[model samples]
Target: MTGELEVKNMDMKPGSTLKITGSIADGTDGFVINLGQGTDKLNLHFNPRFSESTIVCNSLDGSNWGQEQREDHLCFSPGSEVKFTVTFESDKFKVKLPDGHELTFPNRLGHSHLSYLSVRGGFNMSSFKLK
Candidate 1:
């Protein structure tokens, strides 16, 4: 069931680039970006914070999801909230961290595209937009 994901509560797009600004606290696991296709179709998993943060891309049909490790993806401190943005471009996704570093990953699923976007875990998404 491949369809366009336009999160009602949150603003997100499929064919355009999405910039998600948020702060990811420390000591959290299983934080996933729900694409609404399916577990296998499309998803982003935020595992334990190893270096900084991570980004994930999924297919519209919920077939495959790929994860990328970006240094400085998050600014992990005790009180400092990690500020980062996930940039979804035409061909791939790019993650920009607080410290000014970019990490990229290919958008698999044969350009299935991303329509729905949601977050689960100890994170606060301030805004979502296309640029």
Candidate 2:
């Protein structure tokens, strides 16, 4: 599955903000926001698991994975619309959750901009915006 709102060639870089709006369907356990150069080199693998109430973030240079970071207390609820933002930098991606908590993940691939983005899992993506 290509997931909801998958796109490439979108110029989202440091200083620019990426905003996503979506609703979580019932009976869904979790979702993901994958952002990077392409599917081959994923710079940010953002996963929020409702089952664990945890936010898991990781990256990949090739097919191998890097270290994963987790932030507890995953705040988004199922069957409700949520909005989140991500701002990239030279070394990290800053996330602003709908609940006002922040999470950061490494920019291991070292690209100035992340051009590919996607949302998957039990999520019903409504809008993906860059500002």
Candidate 3:
């Protein structure tokens, strides 16, 4: 749970989706991507390929993490390439997988544009962009 990840600079717009495609390192537990600023609230927690069998997403409201399941449908295996998409909208952000599944999170920050992106834990992100 204590590792490092690389984040690129990209300007996100409303109704846009950011696609992250990459191969997880061997024994990769998962990765977490968070957005928003200060106490405004909003976060997208991704549980990459893990032994939990089911993929889980959690919304971090301030310091509280709310477990939101059934959002991630892509199966994760070691060394397998996975694509995760984060969609932005006016009021909410959606997390979608290549397998045609989606989850929604409130745009608690209430902004249509995000300036900073950060990552944590272990994983290899091959490509990412906003579209």
Candidate 4:
């Protein structure tokens, strides 16, 4: 299964939280959350993999990818519904996982406002909101 959701012209500020409620497909490999100006410059690339039992975070800038951060914490299972919140700062993006674990990734792009939010890969989204 493969799908993507994009929100354009929406500002994701420091105090704002982007909440995603969804479930991974039964045979899913992973899903990704991307926040950036466009596809070529992703400030936050949040990827969760069921196959590897890991969560990987990274940044992309004009086709160049930065160092990747991997977390062994696994809060998701295939065919299980989950909800999580993403909050941003100048230096970092903080994620509050469904299992009550927090993960942080660097704000490498460092832009003041991000106008795009995207979710891609093997999952179905029940709801997505910025609050």
Number of clashes in every candidate structure? 5, 0, 0, 0
lDDT of 3 by residue, 1-131 (tens): 33354444456778778887766677766666665442234455656546555666555666776757544355557767778788878787787766766767666556646655556655666787778
In model 1, the runs with Cα more than 4 Å from the true position are 1-15, 25-30, 34-40, 43-75
The residue-level lDDT of candidate 3 at 5 comes to: 49
lDDT of 2 by residue, 1-131 (tens): 74466789988767888888888888888988889998888889999999989989999788899988999958778788999889888877899999899898878888567789977898878887788
lDDT of each: 0.49, 0.85, 0.63, 0.86
Residue-level lDDT tens digits of model 1 in 36-124: 33444553333324333434333344443344443334444433455556665556666565577766656554444455565666565
**What is the RMSD of candidate 1?**
6.2
Order of candidates by TM-score, top first?
2, 4, 3, 1
RMSD of each: 6.2, 1.3, 3.3, 1.4
For model 2, the stretches where C-alpha displacement exceeds 4 angstroms are none
Tell me the tens digit of each residue's lDDT in model 4 across 56-81: 99999998999999999987788889
- TM-scores for candidates 1 onward, in order: 0.56, 0.93, 0.71, 0.93
lDDT of 3 at 130: 70
